[PDB]
Amino acid sequence: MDVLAKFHTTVHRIGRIIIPAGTRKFYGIEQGDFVEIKIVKYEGEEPKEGTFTARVGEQGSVIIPKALRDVIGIKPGEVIEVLLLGHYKPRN
User: Fold this and answer.
1) Count of domains for the chain
2) Angle 63-65-66 from CA coordinates, rounded to 5°
3) Residue 57 belongs to what H/E stretch?
4) Which long-range contacts (CB under 8 A, 24 or more apart) does 68-71 make?
5) 9 neighbors 91 (Cβ within 8 angstroms)
């Protein structure tokens, strides 16, 4: 489908990952904003995927839902390719 930005990162403890500051800048992300993103990693002969919505925290960190970590079989230190799907901003 359509992607707003594409970057690679590996999973760290608690399922947390950090986006490179370059992608945050191109995407216009600030703390408190919401973005919608999907990850894809290949294991054995079957691809595993997961899509969720996440809020931007300090240092551009975002947390994948633990439920998707287990189904996809993802472990600390493994690199996945991440695609952005959409974005939401506060309204006044």
Assistant:
1) 1
2) 110
3) none
4) 68/39, 69/11, 69/15
5) no
Burial class (CB in 10 A: 0-12, 13-18, 19+), 92: exposed
* Contacting residues for 26 by C-beta, under 8 A, at least 6 apart: 5
Whole-number Å distance between alpha carbons of 50 and 15:
13
**∠ CA 27-31-36, rounded to 5°:** 50
Give the whole-angstrom CA distance, residue 64 versus residue 73: 13
Tell me the C-alpha distance between 52 and 79, whole Å. 18
Structural domain that includes position 19: 1-92
Q: Are strands 46-55 and 79-88 parallel, antiparallel or unpaired?
A: unpaired
